[PDB]
Design a protein around this ligand. Sequence first.
Ligand SMILES: Nc1ncnc2c1ncn2[C@@H]1O[C@H](COP(=O)(O)OP(=O)(O)OP(=O)(O)O)[C@@H](O)[C@H]1O
Ligand SMILES: Nc1ncnc2c1ncn2[C@@H]1O[C@H](COP(=O)(O)OP(=O)(O)OP(=O)(O)O)[C@@H](O)[C@H]1O
Ligand SMILES: O=C(NOCCO)c1cc(COCCO)c(F)c(F)c1Nc1ccc(I)cc1F
Ligand SMILES: O=C(NOCCO)c1cc(COCCO)c(F)c(F)c1Nc1ccc(I)cc1F
Ligand SMILES: [Mg+2]
Ligand SMILES: [Mg+2]
Lengths: 288, 288
Amino acid sequence: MELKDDDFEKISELGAGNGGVVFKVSHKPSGLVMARKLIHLEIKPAIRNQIIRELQVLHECNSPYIVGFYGAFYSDGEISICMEHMDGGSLDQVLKKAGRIPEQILGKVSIAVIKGLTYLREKHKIMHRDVKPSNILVNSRGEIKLCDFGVSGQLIDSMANGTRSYMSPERLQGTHYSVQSDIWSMGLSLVEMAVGRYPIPPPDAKELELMFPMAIFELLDYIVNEPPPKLPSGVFSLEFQDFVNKCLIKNPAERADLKQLMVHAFIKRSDAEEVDFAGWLCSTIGLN
Amino acid sequence: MELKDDDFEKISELGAGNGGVVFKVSHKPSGLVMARKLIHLEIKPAIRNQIIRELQVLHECNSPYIVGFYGAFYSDGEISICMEHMDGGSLDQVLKKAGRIPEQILGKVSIAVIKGLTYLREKHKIMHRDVKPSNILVNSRGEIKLCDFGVSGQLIDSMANGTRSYMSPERLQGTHYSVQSDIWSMGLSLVEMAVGRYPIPPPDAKELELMFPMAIFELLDYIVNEPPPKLPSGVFSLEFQDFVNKCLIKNPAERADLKQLMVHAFIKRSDAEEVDFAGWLCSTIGLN
Ligand SMILES: Nc1ncnc2c1ncn2[C@@H]1O[C@H](COP(=O)(O)OP(=O)(O)OP(=O)(O)O)[C@@H](O)[C@H]1O
Ligand SMILES: Nc1ncnc2c1ncn2[C@@H]1O[C@H](COP(=O)(O)OP(=O)(O)OP(=O)(O)O)[C@@H](O)[C@H]1O
Ligand SMILES: O=C(NOCCO)c1cc(COCCO)c(F)c(F)c1Nc1ccc(I)cc1F
Ligand SMILES: O=C(NOCCO)c1cc(COCCO)c(F)c(F)c1Nc1ccc(I)cc1F
Ligand SMILES: [Mg+2]
Ligand SMILES: [Mg+2]
């Protein structure tokens, strides 16, 4: 059935970021609990209609590694995107509660990200464009899924316009970037989650012992002109270290792609491992 | 009297930016039309109360060059700042309608900015921190006034977190910036308004004849490492050119301060000039 503004009842606020709020809502005709994202854009009616039209391809984005979509519509000054409610929230929220995410859990995260990115590329011919811990959602069933990807060319354009960045060196410097940019973001996101803080500027000797704000030109100059961040040695396996190293190669053509990462030792190893992600999640965030 | 959420009725939406919406509202007990800015922050109750408390100093910020303040309060997830409604809107909106602002009008703009900044420094011991055309508001009485300055230390902190920047080279590179940073922003804002587009990267020969998007590392690298932008010669007086040159000196200690700019030839000249700013405004934006 068609979604409209009327038919929704607000339960609570799940969070907000830059240009969006997301509510936990009841869709009253169906009884279904959803996450309803509201994007406020001051744009002409014809552009707004193209955006809505282009979000309908989300009905066709069906994957265990992609957040379910129910519908998208416009109502007073706001574009609504209605999606599956993910009761574990995002990986940035889980990281705050966890302090630090176990390497084994990050093995399952990595698999799901690579698989979601692969699905988007293979089946929809698109890059994600916004990989970072807050765009990876989890639930009490142990599901790990991507949201907030570039499905709509016009919405990409209209959104265009930090104390931290997940954008690749090539994307920071110009228009010459593509699917490889997403690999860098994934790599950086994994280092942050492994280590328990945004990893740029690198943890010094003292910080590493103790666990185991930058101006924005300073930060972006670092990303482009300094060597990429790196997992600590000792605390993480050489497979994981090599995995994030291959994600964080500055030249995007020598950086590993999804095809290579899918057969990387670390993935093979994680693929094999018996991990109770669902139980880990619930304990750390207090679901059950 | 005290302002509360109840007592307000929404008339229309004046605009929105990064972290705020502003509505044209009727305060029903008084009959007064106001601009009510809503800032949504996910912050603990004790911080939120410090913010509200620190915004009360706006009751004490009374100046012909500062947007009037009526009150600030918190209600469901939102900090409200209620201010004087400026029926001419901001200088970014007027620039869109005008294409380009006459040098004589920019003389009056400059005077009002310098005087507002001086008032804030002299009487309140604060820097503005966010000078740019959208934070300079105008009205049909010919008034030009500053809003959106750093009155609250805690709100500054809580807000911390572009395809364009008005931030000085020193502020882009670190913590070593202060009131001089505002002078750079003013200078850059005046060049944008004079010329009719954000002036970085400089207009080439062909663009200048014809009137008379950058990656964000590219843009900020330009601001820090390349020579400052400059007014075209020919179309603008040497006084104006020298004025913006003195604002846009990269070293903030040799950059002119407010004291010097107040006695700069351009100001003396503009101070003397008979300009119908109110009539110019209304014609260009269609008020009367
Ligand atoms: N489908 C969902 N289910 C559960 N929680 C969600 C869902 N979508 C979003 N959220 C929560 O809402 C928050 C805000 O989402 P939003 O995408 O607007 O901002 P963001 O992604 O954190 O950051 P930014 O806007 O800066 O990119 C997310 O951090 C996430 O915690
Ligand atoms: N007191 C006011 N009277 C009339 N219009 C206003 C007033 N305050 C704000 N506005 C309008 O509301 C718009 C949005 O304000 P806001 O400060 O939220 O964003 P901004 O200043 O444009 O940009 P940003 O948030 O990116 O700094 C402004 O451009 C201005 O046009
Ligand atoms: O919301 C989005 N970004 O979040 C920024 C805080 O609003 C978003 C952005 C774009 C365009 O920008 C692409 C990145 O440059 C887009 F096309 C979307 F479809 C988006 N949303 C979205 C996508 C898939 C699902 I399943 C659920 C969603 F909500
Ligand atoms: O709103 C503000 N910024 O705008 C960004 C879109 O929300 C704003 C920000 C700060 C803190 O940040 C300082 C700059 O770094 C502050 F202290 C304010 F009082 C603000 N508002 C404000 C100030 C004076 C008047 I008169 C009316 C106002 F609305
Ligand atoms: Mg998001
Ligand atoms: Mg503003």
